[PDB]
Amino acid sequence: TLILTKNQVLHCQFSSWYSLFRKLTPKAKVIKPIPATVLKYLHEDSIYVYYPEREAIQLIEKAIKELGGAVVPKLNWSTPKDALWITTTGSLKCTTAEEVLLLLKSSDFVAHDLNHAFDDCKDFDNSVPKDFSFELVLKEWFPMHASTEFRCFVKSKRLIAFCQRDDNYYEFLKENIDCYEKLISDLLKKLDTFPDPDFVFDVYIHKDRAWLIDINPFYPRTDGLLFSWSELESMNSENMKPEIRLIPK
Ligand SMILES: Nc1ncnc2c1ncn2[C@@H]1O[C@H](COP(=O)(O)OP(=O)(O)O)[C@@H](O)[C@H]1O
């Protein structure tokens, strides 16, 4: 019953919401459109240990320098969180263009952005829409406490649910859940310019400050984590309290 439109996917591109919410979200640079030689390199399906032209490499490392020397890369929608297995350090942290490119090339999520981004859109048959372009996003890296990140579900512009984003129990959350809820609620009021009524936003809350991390479609390809999409779909938006789930001890 839940359907996904082309516009819903387009509205969640990093460039589309970073613009809206620059004051709420960690610093980032966007290279758009993505350099063609970079795009060409990212489609390689090699497993063993071509390369973009120097101009692209310098452009990327200019952005890295400007962000303080360490970044997390992504394309329009997906962060290559799945591709930690290929990094020499086990981290999303990239300090050179080589590291950025290796991480992006090895991600299933990134590959999904590149080849299948609009395949679930009922109003778009398949290939990409007019006036669309891929973009290379370099987010400033910062160490973040995995257990104070949340995924927050919005339906008819109301917060119906949110959950802990990682999978480790963290007792501090239980004692402080009303504080987290208020900060998430307050952030959602500041997302008033987001154009769709239903969506999913990720937040990092640190020292009483909420940071917007990502916005994704209200659709089962967005991991529901501690919620199932069956319950998210049926959940009533008129409730005055959101459902809150944390990892059990
Ligand atoms: N700027 C950053 N610095 C450090 N870690 C990050 C940064 N951005 C994202 N991460 C880590 O990568 C994971 C994926 O982040 P996100 O950008 O929300 O991608 P997605 O929404 O595709 O999961 C997050 O859970 C976070 O732990």
Side-chain angles (χ1 to χ4, degrees), residues 1-240 242-249:
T1 306
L2 267 188
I3 75 117
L4 185 67
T5 68
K6 171 187 65 103
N7 277 350
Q8 279 174 285
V9 170
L10 287 174
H11 294 159
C12 284
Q13 299 170 95
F14 192 90
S15 56
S16 297
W17 60 261
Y18 179 74
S19 38
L20 297 181
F21 302 130
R22 182 186 314 261
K23 297 163 195 174
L24 312 168
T25 188
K27 187 176 186 201
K29 299 281 183 178
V30 184
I31 299 169
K32 190 186 182 58
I34 191 165
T37 65
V38 167
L39 197 47
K40 200 271 202 306
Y41 172 90
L42 290 181
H43 278 105
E44 296 184 13
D45 63 12
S46 183
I47 51 174
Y48 312 113
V49 184
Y50 185 80
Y51 199 75
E53 70 183 51
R54 180 174 161 85
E55 286 90 355
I57 303 298
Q58 294 300 320
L59 195 48
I60 295 175
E61 284 171 353
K62 170 178 272 302
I64 297 180
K65 172 191 49 190
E66 285 167 7
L67 291 167
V71 306
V72 171
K74 64 182 283 177
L75 302 190
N76 307 49
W77 303 273
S78 309
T79 304
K81 53 170 173 286
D82 64 298
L84 261 54
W85 53 269
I86 200 168
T87 63
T88 64
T89 73
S91 174
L92 282 176
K93 185 182 190 181
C94 298
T95 56
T96 70
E98 192 181 18
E99 280 178 322
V100 159
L101 290 165
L102 192 139
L103 187 59
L104 294 178
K105 192 186 102 177
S106 314
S107 173
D108 299 316
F109 291 137
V110 169
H112 189 79
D113 282 14
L114 280 183
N115 304 312
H116 300 296
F118 298 94
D119 291 356
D120 288 327
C121 305
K122 193 182 176 179
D123 60 351
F124 195 78
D125 26 281
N126 315 75
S127 52
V128 294
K130 345 83 234 232
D131 307 347
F132 164 84
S133 69
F134 290 106
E135 57 201 34
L136 172 59
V137 179
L138 302 172
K139 303 182 297 161
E140 176 161 353
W141 175 89
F142 54 97
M144 56 155 52
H145 197 8
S147 297
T148 64
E149 216 207 328
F150 301 90
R151 175 154 290 183
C152 311
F153 300 87
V154 177
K155 181 196 286 190
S156 312
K157 293 307 200 186
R158 294 168 53 81
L159 180 73
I160 59 168
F162 72 89
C163 61
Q164 186 173 355
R165 256 255 259 171
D166 68 321
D167 44 33
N168 292 296
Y169 168 78
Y170 186 35
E171 69 295 334
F172 183 78
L173 304 181
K174 192 87 175 300
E175 334 170 326
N176 294 279
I177 200 53
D178 296 322
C179 183
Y180 286 115
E181 178 183 353
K182 171 60 162 45
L183 292 176
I184 292 172
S185 189
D186 286 346
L187 178 55
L188 175 59
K189 291 174 178 65
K190 291 174 194 163
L191 303 182
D192 56 286
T193 46
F194 192 73
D196 301 318
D198 317 331
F199 59 96
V200 181
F201 67 101
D202 292 339
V203 293
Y204 176 56
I205 298 178
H206 181 71
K207 301 170 128 315
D208 286 329
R209 183 170 183 179
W211 299 82
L212 176 70
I213 300 298
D214 201 10
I215 299 183
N216 288 294
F218 192 86
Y219 190 75
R221 198 162 295 272
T222 302
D223 199 339
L225 297 177
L226 298 182
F227 296 96
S228 70
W229 276 101
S230 306
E231 64 196 324
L232 287 168
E233 186 174 354
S234 63
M235 212 171 307
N236 182 17
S237 60
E238 285 137 278
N239 267 69
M240 310 303 177
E243 278 196 36
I244 303 169
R245 292 181 188 174
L246 311 171
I247 296 288
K249 195 210 315 183

